[PDB]
Design a protein around this ligand. Structure first.
Ligand SMILES: [Hg+2]
Ligand SMILES: [Hg+2]
Ligand SMILES: [Hg+2]
Ligand SMILES: [Hg+2]
Length: 261
């Protein structure tokens, strides 16, 4: 947590009286950045994170037919995800032998964990955990701009919607319940992350709430958690897109991580 000085760097002076983007919200009401292209200088951020020797874990579950998505997912992650930084891929799968042999860049590693003491394993191996769906591909840069204690990503189908249209859990009997007059954003579970400690907090809360609903005979739990524990960054839909369903709107300067058609 002691941080060394940055080196001399040459880049354009930020302009106090020029908004960064005039077409989108770039900060939430609790002062968390909303990550859009144009908001960050990746050279500055790369320096800051490299100087801390940052390691990023990327976790994916690939069960049954979803193993078929791993080759493209990992090949494209190699091109676009945290390039230059230490990356540990964690692939959770029922088919260890079906994980494709993907060639990795230096400083990058992959663990296969079979699914039908180790939570501490993430704590000792990585600084940040990023949790994504495997039936996706990277098409453009996804880097250290996303890293923060806790982040969620705007659901691409709902970023322009009013909160009453959000498909939050609406049954008051559920632990996930959000009433019509509450809600900041509609976050999608396909891309979230943060420090290991904050990600483990989130998944522990979600698991307990789901068990409680289960006992009572009942994205919703994620959305409840992030309502009540505000993320320290929010990722724009550049980070979670479906071009076939939604096209390429002008508000998206890049399409970084997308559904496979
Ligand atoms: Hg800017
Ligand atoms: Hg995770
Ligand atoms: Hg939750
Ligand atoms: Hg969750």
């Amino acid at each position: 947590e002691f941080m060394v000085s940055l080196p001399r760097m040459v880049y354009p002076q930020p302009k106090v009286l020029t908004p960064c983007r005039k077409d989108v919200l770039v900060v939430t009401p609790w002062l968390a950045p909303i990550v859009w292209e144009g908001t960050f200088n990746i050279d500055i951020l790369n320096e800051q994170f490299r100087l801390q020797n940052t390691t990023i874990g990327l976790t994916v579950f690939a069960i049954k037919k979803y193993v078929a998505f791993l080759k493209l997912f990992l090949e494209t992650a190699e091109k676009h995800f945290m390039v230059g930084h230490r990356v540990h891929y964690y692939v959770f799968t029922d088919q260890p032998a079906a994980v494709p042999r993907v060639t990795l860049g230096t400083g990058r590693q992959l663990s296969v964990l079979e699914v039908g003491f180790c939570e501490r394993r993430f704590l000792s191996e990585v600084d940040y955990l990023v949790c994504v769906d495997v039936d996706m591909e990277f098409r453009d840069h996804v880097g250290v701009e996303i890293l923060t204690p806790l982040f969620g990503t705007l659901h691409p189908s709902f970023y322009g919607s009013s909160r009453e249209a959000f498909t939050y859990e609406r049954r008051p009997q559920s632990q996930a319940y959000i009433p019509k007059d509450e809600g900041d954003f509609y976050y999608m579970g396909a891309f979230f992350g943060g420090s290991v400690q904050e990600v483990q907090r989130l998944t522990r809360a979600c698991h307990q709430a789901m068990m409680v609903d289960q006992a009572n005979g009942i994205d919703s739990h994620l959305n409840k958690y992030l309502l009540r524990h505000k993320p320290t960054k929010v990722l724009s839909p550049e980070y979670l897109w479906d071009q076939q369903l939604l096209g390429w709107p002008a508000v998206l300067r890049k399409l970084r991580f997308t559904a496979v058609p």
